[PDB]
Amino acid sequence: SHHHH
Amino acid sequence: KNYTDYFFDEPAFDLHDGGYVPLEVSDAPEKPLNVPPLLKPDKETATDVYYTVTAEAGETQLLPGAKTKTWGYNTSLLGQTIVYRRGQHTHVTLKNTLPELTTFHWHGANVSGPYVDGGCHAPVYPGESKHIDFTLEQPATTLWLHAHPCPSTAEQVWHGLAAMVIVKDDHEASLPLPRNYGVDDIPVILQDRRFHENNQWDYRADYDPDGVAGPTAMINGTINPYFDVTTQKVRLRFLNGANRREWRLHFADDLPFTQIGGDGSLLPEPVKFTHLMLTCAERAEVIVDFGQYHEGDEVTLYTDDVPLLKFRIHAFKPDQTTLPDKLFDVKAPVVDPALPVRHVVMQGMDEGVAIDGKKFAMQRIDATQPIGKAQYWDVTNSNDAPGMVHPFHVHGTQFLVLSRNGHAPYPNEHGFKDTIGVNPGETVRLLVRFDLPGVYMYHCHIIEHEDGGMMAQIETFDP
Amino acid sequence: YTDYFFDEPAFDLHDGGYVPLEVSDAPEKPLNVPPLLKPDKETATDVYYTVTAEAGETQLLPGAKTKTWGYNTSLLGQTIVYRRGQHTHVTLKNTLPELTTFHWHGANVSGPYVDGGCHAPVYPGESKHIDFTLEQPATTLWLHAHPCPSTAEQVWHGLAAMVIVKDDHEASLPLPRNYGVDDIPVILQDRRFHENNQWDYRADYDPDGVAGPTAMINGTINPYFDVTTQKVRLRFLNGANRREWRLHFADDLPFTQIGGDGSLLPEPVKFTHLMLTCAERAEVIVDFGQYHEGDEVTLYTDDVPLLKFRIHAFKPDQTTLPDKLFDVKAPVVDPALPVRHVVMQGMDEGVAIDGKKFAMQRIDATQPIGKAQYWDVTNSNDAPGMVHPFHVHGTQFLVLSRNGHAPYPNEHGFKDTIGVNPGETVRLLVRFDLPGVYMYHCHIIEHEDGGMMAQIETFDP
Numbered sequence: 050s051h052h053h054h
Numbered sequence: 055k056n057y058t059d060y061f062f063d064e065p066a067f068d069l070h071d072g073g074y075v076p077l078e079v080s081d082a083p084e085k086p087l088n089v090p091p092l093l094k095p096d097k098e099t100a101t102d103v104y105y106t107v108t109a110e111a112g113e114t115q116l117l118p119g120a121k122t123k124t125w126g127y128n129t130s131l132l133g134q135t136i137v138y139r140r141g142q143h144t145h146v147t148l149k150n151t152l153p154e155l156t157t158f159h160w161h162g163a164n165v166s167g168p169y170v171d172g173g174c175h176a177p178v179y180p181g182e183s184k185h186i187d188f189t190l191e192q193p194a195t196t197l198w199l200h201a202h203p204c205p206s207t208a209e210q211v212w213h214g215l216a217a218m219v220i221v222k223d224d225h226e227a228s229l230p231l232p233r234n235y236g237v238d239d240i241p242v243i244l245q246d247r248r249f250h251e252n253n254q255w256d257y258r259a260d261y262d263p264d265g266v267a268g269p270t271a272m273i274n275g276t277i278n279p280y281f282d283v284t285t286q287k288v289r290l291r292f293l294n295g296a297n298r299r300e301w302r303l304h305f306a307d308d309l310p311f312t313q314i315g316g317d318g319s320l321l322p323e324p325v326k327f328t329h330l331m332l333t334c335a336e337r338a339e340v341i342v343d344f345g346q347y348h349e350g351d352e353v354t355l356y357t358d359d360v361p362l363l364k365f366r367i368h369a370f371k372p373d374q375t376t377l378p379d380k381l382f383d384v385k386a387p388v389v390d391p392a393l394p395v396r397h398v399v400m401q402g403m404d405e406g407v408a409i410d411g412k413k414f415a416m417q418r419i420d421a422t423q424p425i426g427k428a429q430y431w432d433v434t435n436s437n438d439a440p441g442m443v444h445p446f447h448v449h450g451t452q453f454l455v456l457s458r459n460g461h462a463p464y465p466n467e468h469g470f471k472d473t474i475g476v477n478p479g480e481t482v483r484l485l486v487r488f489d490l491p492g493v494y495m496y497h498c499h500i501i502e503h504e505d506g507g508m509m510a511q512i513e514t515f516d517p
Numbered sequence: 518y519t520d521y522f523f524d525e526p527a528f529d530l531h532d533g534g535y536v537p538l539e540v541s542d543a544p545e546k547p548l549n550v551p552p553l554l555k556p557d558k559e560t561a562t563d564v565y566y567t568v569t570a571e572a573g574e575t576q577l578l579p580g581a582k583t584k585t586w587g588y589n590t591s592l593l594g595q596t597i598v599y600r601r602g603q604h605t606h607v608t609l610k611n612t613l614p615e616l617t618t619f620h621w622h623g624a625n626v627s628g629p630y631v632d633g634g635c636h637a638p639v640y641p642g643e644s645k646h647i648d649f650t651l652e653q654p655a656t657t658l659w660l661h662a663h664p665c666p667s668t669a670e671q672v673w674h675g676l677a678a679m680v681i682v683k684d685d686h687e688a689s690l691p692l693p694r695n696y697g698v699d700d701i702p703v704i705l706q707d708r709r710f711h712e713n714n715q716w717d718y719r720a721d722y723d724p725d726g727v728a729g730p731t732a733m734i735n736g737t738i739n740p741y742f743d744v745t746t747q748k749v750r751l752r753f754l755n756g757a758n759r760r761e762w763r764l765h766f767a768d769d770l771p772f773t774q775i776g777g778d779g780s781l782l783p784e785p786v787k788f789t790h791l792m793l794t795c796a797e798r799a800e801v802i803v804d805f806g807q808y809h810e811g812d813e814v815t816l817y818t819d820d821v822p823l824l825k826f827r828i829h830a831f832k833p834d835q836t837t838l839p840d841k842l843f844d845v846k847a848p849v850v851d852p853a854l855p856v857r858h859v860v861m862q863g864m865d866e867g868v869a870i871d872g873k874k875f876a877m878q879r880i881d882a883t884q885p886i887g888k889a890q891y892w893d894v895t896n897s898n899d900a901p902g903m904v905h906p907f908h909v910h911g912t913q914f915l916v917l918s919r920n921g922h923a924p925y926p927n928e929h930g931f932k933d934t935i936g937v938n939p940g941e942t943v944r945l946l947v948r949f950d951l952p953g954v955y956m957y958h959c960h961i962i963e964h965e966d967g968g969m970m971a972q973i974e975t976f977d978p
């Protein structure tokens with residue numbers, strides 16, 4: 050579910 | 055929610071840079087992570103070890119088609135891992151079979167300068183052999199060997215001259231830590247490159263005075279690596295061997311992992327992480343527990359939103375072992391009260407980089423400090439408006455981090471370090487003691503900044 | 518003087534790795550004559566110059582422009598005029614993406630900053646100032662890069678420029694002196710071209726000397742020169758990394774040498790064939806008197822054509838050269854001082870001077886300023902061997918003997934570079950006017966970078 054920046 | 059996870063200042067991250075190069079996933083087929091073999095001693099006893107380290111040129115299959123022209127130590131790219139032991143007299147023949155002169159720097163190793171240290175003043179010409187002798191009196195840790203001509207350190211590292219150095223001792227050996235090199239304890243040397251036509255590198259074509267960075271991640275000289283896990287717990291020795299890029303490490307699903315070591319030593323106490331940021335030259339040793347996973351599972355380490363390294367999970371024995379609350383006793387020197395506070399100011403970016411108002415001069419001594427006596431260093435990164443994180447490094451010492459802008463160090467900075475990222479506008483207070491006499495460099499370890507002259511030298515003496 | 522002075526067995530063309538010159542298929546075109554660098558300011562007692570190392574592009578062949586470096590232009594450099602006794606102020610500016618150095622080859626200037634050798638870095642974007650007053654005879658010097666390493670890589674990129682030094686004596690002599698018309702640089706170099714007309718020093722690297730097959734004259738391929746006068750002055754500079762030039766015309770047209778590295782020759786010397794090793798200079802006069810409009814005379818090295826001279830109509834001019842050009846005042850050697858021995862040794866990777874490779878922070882020798890000493894310089898290497906052009910910073914020396922015999926006919930003037938044949942000991946008379954740290958080395962540039970280089974400190978007693 051989670052993407053970074 | 056809407057915080058950055060990592061300890062450094064989010065506005066200063068490398069990815070806010072004008073000339074920032076994002077990583078791109080390569081098409082290259084996935085393949086086993088190259089684990090550099092352990093360099094076999096020439097001979098060994100309990101008191102003496104003998105090694106031959108050979109800078110050489112060659113070719114390395116990295117991408118499909120033509121092999122990449124590369125440099126390495128006792129291998130075509132990077133280097134065989136070199137094991138040193140505290141208290142063991144260590145003897146090294148340095149041999150240069152490159153067509154250019156080089157230098158053998160043991161980053162983080164407390165050895166005499168300037169010859170043993172292998173900095174700017176220790177040339178080894180093509181075809182020449184040098185002999186060095188030393189006995190390490192420092193705790194177990196992960197160091198590394200890289201080239202260090204002044205200039206160009208950046209070119210030669212880019213060519214491929216970097217190698218992991220593992221320092222052993224009795225204390226670390228007594229800890230319940232994964233230690234089967236290549237099976238449950240591995241180097242993870244993090245680098246990037248740009249591949250041109252015929253899969254070749256070209257440093258000068260890619261040159262940028264503010265740091266060189268290519269789109270292709272390279273781990274132990276492997277593109278799109280996977281590692282086959284056969285144990286529950288795995289130790290990863292992260293080394294940032296990139297010219298400039300910062301790594302923001304985390305698993306796809308935020309699998310926790312515990313840091314047990316830094317540049318110069320084990321941490322005093324294990325520190326639990328979800329997200330870990332490394333600047334250039336920093337090492338961080340972590341334990342990952344794959345207990346939640348099952349045969350067939352493939353778990354990926356990312357940097358930001360880019361996949362780096364895959365962990366293929368196979369059957370593994372239950373591991374019930376548990377880390378102690380304290381790993382290592384950190385014995386801080388007392389500050390010699392006779393000595394003042396040394397102030398080191400890192401300034402500029404791009405072409406204007408400097409330390410304390412000047413660019414490095416080979417022949418110029420910038421500083422003196424007595425051996426055996428410990429001094430506070432206040433290291434400031436003066437540029438702010440939009441700024442960048444400068445990894446400050448000193449030769450011939452493992453220092454301690456006392457404070458950041460008058461506040462606590464980051465949670466993973468309570469052991470011995472040799473490289474610290476300094477945020478824009480920030481002053482960090484380090485506790486620096488040199489054991490041996492010599493001439494030692496101190497500089498920013500963004501390697502283009504190094505070569506651009508953001509570097510000074512200190513002469514240590516016996517009083 | 519019909520054949521070359523140096524030992525034939527030792528010529529570059531006997532090396533195992535020899536690269537012959539080949540005539541390029543590129544179009545013939547006018548010889549580039551570098552413009553004179555215009556001063557920023559000038560009076561009679563002061564001159565002010567800005568010299569900028571820059572990176573650019575040059576049409577050398579059809580298609581893509583070659584990536585080059587130069588001073589105040591994309592390749593080579595604008596010629597720089599200095600005057601004996603004039604206080605010279607130079608801003609040294611570096612717009613390269615790499616650090617460099619500004620070495621004035623043959624200039625009697627203080628070391629090691631002004632000399633601009635190994636110890637005078639200038640980083641990208643940085644400026645430096647230098648001040649000097651030349652107190653030496655008129656001659657042709659040159660400027661080139663001198664980071665240690667790599668001088669070879671930077672020269673290869675194109676950092677070299679002719680420096681002309683004026684004095685009253687030379688002004689009063691009857692010599693062609695109209696820059697770009699009857700008095701021209703002949704900067705002799707070679708290069709190897711790769712895909713897209715690019716250079717790649719490191720691909721072409723050889724530790725014994727780098728040489729490509731295509732000759733390059735003042736950064737021109739296949740040049741011709743339009744002669745509009747009977748007499749022409751050529752200022753020959755060997756700016757090759759390694760190649761020797763063996764110079765002669767068709768019809769064995771004679772030419773007369775008036776100048777060497779450091780000064781006018783004491784007397785003019787008539788030539789049919791002339792050899793130059795790395796960094797040597799030779800100013801010659803060519804007389805085209807016996808040729809008519811539309812005639813064509815070619816300058817060759819060995820069997821290879823280099824430069825076509827096209828003869829147009831010229832006013833007659835037969836005003837000949839005096840028997841004596843220049844008065845050479847040899848200093849008395851100091852009898853206090855001993856004979857210094859310098860031994861150049863090895864080839865390829867084993868090149869060395871007096872047993873050791875160059876070290877930046879080691880001083881290898883000392884000598885008092887104002888005091889002259891015999892330097893015996895030996896080329897020790899046996900069997901086949903090479904001619905090593907030995908060069909000393911901070912001085913113009915005199916040549917006394919070669920293996921106990923007379924120097925070559927063109928070596929009675931001041932020189933800063935001398936070719937030492939295999940097995941040969943040459944005796945030099947060396948004096949330093951100024952204190953500093955000056956290097957001495959072979960001027961085969963790969964050998965310099967390969968460590969065949971030492972350094973001497975001069976001090977006031």
Ligand SMILES: [Cu+2]
Binds near residue numbers: 161200335499
């Ligand atoms: Cu380092």
Ligand SMILES: [Cu+2]
Binds near residue numbers: 160162447
């Ligand atoms: Cu270091």
Ligand SMILES: [Cu+2]
Binds near residue numbers: 443444445498500503
């Ligand atoms: Cu920096």
Ligand SMILES: [Cu+2]
Binds near residue numbers: 173202449497
């Ligand atoms: Cu360093």
Ligand SMILES: [Cu+2]
Binds near residue numbers: 622661796960
């Ligand atoms: Cu020179």
Ligand SMILES: [Cu+2]
Binds near residue numbers: 620623
């Ligand atoms: Cu010189």
Ligand SMILES: [Cu+2]
Binds near residue numbers: 906959964
């Ligand atoms: Cu030589």
Ligand SMILES: [Cu+2]
Binds near residue numbers: 663956958
């Ligand atoms: Cu020189």
